[PDB]
Amino acid sequence: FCDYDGHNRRQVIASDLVLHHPHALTLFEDFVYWTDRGTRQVMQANKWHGGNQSVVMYSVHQPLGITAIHP
Amino acid sequence: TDESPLCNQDSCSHFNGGCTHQCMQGPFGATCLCPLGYQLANDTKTCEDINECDIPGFCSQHCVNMRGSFRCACDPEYTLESDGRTCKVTGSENPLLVVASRDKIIVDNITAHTHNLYSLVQDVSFVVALDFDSVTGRVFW
Amino acid sequence: XXLXXX
Amino acid sequence: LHFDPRDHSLPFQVISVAGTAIALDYDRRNNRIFFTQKLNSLRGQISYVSLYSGSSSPTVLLSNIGVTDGI
Amino acid sequence: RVPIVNTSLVWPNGLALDLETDLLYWADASLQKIERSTLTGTNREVVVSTAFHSFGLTVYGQYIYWTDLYT
Amino acid sequence: XXNXX
Ligand SMILES: *[C@@H]1O[C@H](CO)[C@@H](O)[C@H](O[C@@H]2O[C@H](CO)[C@@H](O)[C@H](O)[C@H]2NC(C)=O)[C@H]1NC(C)=O
Ligand SMILES: *[C@@H]1O[C@H](CO)[C@@H](O[C@@H]2O[C@H](CO)[C@@H](O)[C@H](O)[C@H]2NC(C)=O)[C@H](O)[C@H]1NC(C)=O
Numbered sequence: 001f002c003d004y005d006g007h008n009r010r011q012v013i014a015s016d017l018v019l020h021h022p023h024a025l026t027l028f029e030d031f032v033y034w035t036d037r038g039t040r041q042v043m044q045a046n047k048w049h050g051g052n053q054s055v056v057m058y059s060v061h062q063p064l065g066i067t068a069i070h071p
Numbered sequence: 072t073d074e075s076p077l078c079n080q081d082s083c084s085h086f087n088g089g090c091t092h093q094c095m096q097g098p099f100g101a102t103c104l105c106p107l108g109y110q111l112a113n114d115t116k117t118c119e120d121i122n123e124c125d126i127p128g129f130c131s132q133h134c135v136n137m138r139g140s141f142r143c144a145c146d147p148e149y150t151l152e153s154d155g156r157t158c159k160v161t162g163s164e165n166p167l168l169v170v171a172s173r174d175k176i177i178v179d180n181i182t183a184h185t186h187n188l189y190s191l192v193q194d195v196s197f198v199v200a201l202d203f204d205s206v207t208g209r210v211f212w
Numbered sequence: 213x214x215l216x217x218x
Numbered sequence: 219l220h221f222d223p224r225d226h227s228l229p230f231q232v233i234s235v236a237g238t239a240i241a242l243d244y245d246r247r248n249n250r251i252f253f254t255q256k257l258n259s260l261r262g263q264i265s266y267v268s269l270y271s272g273s274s275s276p277t278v279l280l281s282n283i284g285v286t287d288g289i
Numbered sequence: 290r291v292p293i294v295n296t297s298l299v300w301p302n303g304l305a306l307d308l309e310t311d312l313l314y315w316a317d318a319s320l321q322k323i324e325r326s327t328l329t330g331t332n333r334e335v336v337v338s339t340a341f342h343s344f345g346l347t348v349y350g351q352y353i354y355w356t357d358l359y360t
Numbered sequence: 361x362x363n364x365x
């Protein structure tokens with residue numbers, strides 16, 4: 001993530017084997033969710049340090065799009 | 072250990088040993104201590120403030136740094152918790168997570184953190200993009 | 213997997 | 219393999235062995251490596267080869283063991 | 290003969306010991322993680338949160354090296 | 361897969 005001008009670029013997951021081919025991304029409170037076309041899963045992690053990782057669900061096909069429905 | 076690396080430091084009788092806060096003069100020369108939200112300098116000369124807002128995700132929104140502490144606030148859609156760092160959404164409405172597998176839009180009820188899955192729509196063939204409109208409560212794909 | 217969604 | 223990722227030179231030339239080698243340990247005093255060989259999924263050997271080079275070839279220490287996954 | 294760690298291991302293929310700090314390392318093929326602990330197994334921790342089908346493990350210097358069967 | 365050699 002980074003500022004609107006690209007400054008203060010920071011890493012929330014990096015040099016981690018759990019990413020294979022991530023496609024799309026979603027935020028809610030302090031979680032980040034993303035769809036992986038490699039593992040065919042949608043994941044959950046803490047949006048500041050990636051530290052509390054889990055599988056949301058396993059998909060038969062490649063999960064392409066994701067969004068969080070909330071006001 | 073008698074010729075300790077921390078030896079030949081003046082006792083606290085030497086004008087508080089130059090420490091800016093509470094002071095100790097134990098067997099190993101002398102030691103400067105700092106209150107909560109402070110840290111020692113490199114040369115242990117003075118206490119220095121922690122910039123609690125310079126560590127990402129310490130405070131979930133709008134971190135403000137004070138001389139020895141921090142202040143936090145969250146957007147009108149969020150309410151601060153017991154700890155002055157975390158906030159949650161103010162709504163009674165829970166989040167739902169929607170994902171696009173080839174044949175089906177899948178909805179996940181993040182209700183009671185149980186993750187209860189069900190389909191949104193039946194006729195779908197190959198969904199790629201997903202977004203929603205809060206004004207009309209519709210899902211676009 | 214190649215990046216091109218198609 | 220060198221510990222340096224940027225160093226592409228092989229520490230020693232590849233040593234060929236019979237069957238499929240599995241598990242390894244190194245003897246500092248004699249500069250020899252003990253390794254198990256799995257053969258026909260039912261038998262196995264423990265062999266060593268000298269890293270002093272000088273046209274050294276692997277020789278067997280014990281035979282007729284079976285599948286052996288650790289040294 | 291006593292068990293050190295016996296709670297949540299499935300497929301502990303790899304095991305390594307660091308004499309410099311007297312910590313024990315191991316890798317799980319199914320859990321896909323590498324864990325460290327004291328020799329008594331008290332201070333259990335996770336070093337790598339995804340390591341795939343790790344088979345071997347070895348620690349030298351400041352790094353832990355492991356072979357992966359999957360990739 | 362299979363946890364053999
Ligand atoms: C892998 O190792 C096995 C056991 O030593 C070896 O047999 C393979 O090499 C070749 O296998 C063929 C079928 O068994 C055989 O016809 C051929 O002669 C053999 N070559 C040698 C030099 O023995 C090895 N295969 C690979 C891909 O490395
Ligand atoms: C994952 O969740 C755990 C709790 O389930 C958090 O654990 C604490 O994190 C701090 C900061 O890294 C550690 O110093 C503490 O020792 C942890 N407490 C316990 C009880 O183990 C953790 O913050 C989350 N994230 C990470 C990176 O693990």
Ligand SMILES: *[C@@H]1O[C@H](CO)[C@@H](O[C@@H]2O[C@H](CO)[C@@H](O)[C@H](O)[C@H]2NC(C)=O)[C@H](O)[C@H]1NC(C)=O
Pocket residue numbers: 164165180182187
């Ligand atoms: C998915 O989320 C919605 C909204 O929170 C849930 O709908 C309400 O659930 C509560 C508790 O069961 C009921 O009191 C309400 O009457 C429900 N709404 C309606 C229109 O009846 C829904 O139950 C959630 N799904 C699951 C399986 O938890």
Ligand SMILES: *[C@@H]1O[C@H](CO)[C@@H](O[C@@H]2O[C@H](CO)[C@@H](O)[C@H](O)[C@H]2NC(C)=O)[C@H](O)[C@H]1NC(C)=O
Pocket residue numbers: 292293295296
């Ligand atoms: C896992 O290992 C622990 C030891 O670390 C076992 O706990 C002991 O169990 C015996 C009975 O079998 C008790 O008499 C001991 O007092 C226990 N020790 C402690 C420190 O609790 C435990 O039983 C093992 N569990 C399994 C599934 O084997």
Ligand SMILES: *[C@@H]1O[C@H](CO)[C@@H](O)[C@H](O)[C@H]1NC(C)=O
Pocket residue numbers: 113
């Ligand atoms: C403190 O000392 C360390 C080690 O010499 C050095 O790397 C660091 O930059 C110093 N920090 C400050 C604030 O002087």
Ligand SMILES: [Ca+2]
Pocket residue numbers: 019020021
């Ligand atoms: Ca990739």
Ligand SMILES: [Ca+2]
Pocket residue numbers: 108120121122123136137138139140141
């Ligand atoms: Ca402060």
